A paper describes a structure:
α-Actinin-2 (ACTN2) is the only muscle isoform of α-actinin expressed in cardiac muscle. All four isoforms of α-actinin consist of an N-terminal actin binding domain (ABD) comprising two calponin homology (CH) domains, connected via a flexible linker, which allows for conformational flexibility in the ABDs, to a rod domain. Thus ACTN2 is important in cross-linking actin and titin filaments in the Z-disc.
The original family reported to have an association of the A119T mutation with HCM, had a variable phenotype, with some patients only developing heart failure at the age of 75, and others showing heart failure at ages 36–44. However, although continuous densities are observed for the loop region at residues 110–120 in both the WT and the A119T mutant structure, this region is disordered for G111V mutant between residues 112 and 117. For both the WT and A119T mutant structure, Val112 is orientated towards the interior of the molecule packing the side chain into a hydrophobic region. G111V lies just outside one of the three stretches of amino acid residues thought to mediate actin binding (residues 41–50, 116–140 and 145–165, reviewed in) and A119T lies within one of these stretches.
Residue numbers in the entry: 34 to 112, 117 to 257
């Protein structure tokens, strides 16, 4: 049930990490993409392609037309109705944004003949190989104690963190410490809530994949 809250936080932070490059931000993902304008902008920033010109009209049919420019573009890149987005359907909006994250942050990742989600997982497993207290098997329970994230940072930037000093006792601090370092030194905004991750039996993998993908791109 806490999945919506986790996706809202993380997907909003991810969107904002890109929209800032176009001079704007969103705040409330359940309403701020209704008119399609910032959704089109997001797609342009992350794809590097131009979309058709937006319609700044205020009525429903103007919004449908903008949202279609976005959905039709997405459909051209990936192997839902505009009304769902224009009507502020929360589940469908989060689903649409996951589609975008998966396509533009994750799909093109390729490591050892392994692509997309599976490729990002293999990369994480390769980079955390040296750490005996880490066992990445998935994008949920494997990341709960914060050591995985800390290890990703240490593997590339041992100047930024003393990994030996860490252990499983303080998962909340482990997660926050990684996020603080990433924000301060890797230009990666904080996209998770440490409390939610630790206190949920199975954290939301879409949220975790989103954040972890930012580390992949920072270090590539």
């Amino acid at each position: 049930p806490a999945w919506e809250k986790q996706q809202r936080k993380t997907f909003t932070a991810w969107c904002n990490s890109h929209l800032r490059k176009a001079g704007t931000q969103i705040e409330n993902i359940e309403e701020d993409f209704r008119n399609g304008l910032k959704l089109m902008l997001l797609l342009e920033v992350i794809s590097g392609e131009r979309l058709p010109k937006p319609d700044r009209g205020k009525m429903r049919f103007h919004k449908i037309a903008n949202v279609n420019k976005a959905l039709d573009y997405i459909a051209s890149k990936v192997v839902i109705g505009a009304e769902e987005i224009v009507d502020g359907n929360v589940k469908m909006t989060l689903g649409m944004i996951w589609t975008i994250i998966l396509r533009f942050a994750i799909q093109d990742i390729s490591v050892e003949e392994t692509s997309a989600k599976e490729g990002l997982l293999l990369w994480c497993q390769r980079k955390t190989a040296p750490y005996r207290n880490v066992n990445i098997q998935n994008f949920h329970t494997s990341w709960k104690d914060g050591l995985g994230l800390c290890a990703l940072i240490h593997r590339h930037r041992p100047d930024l963190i003393d990994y030996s000093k860490l252990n499983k006792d303080d998962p909340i601090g482990n997660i926050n410490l990684a996020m603080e370092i990433a924000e301060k030194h890797l230009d990666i905004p904080k996209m998770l809530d440490a409390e939610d991750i630790v206190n949920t039996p199975k954290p939301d993998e879409r949220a975790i994949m989103t954040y972890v993908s930012c580390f992949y791109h920072a270090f590539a």
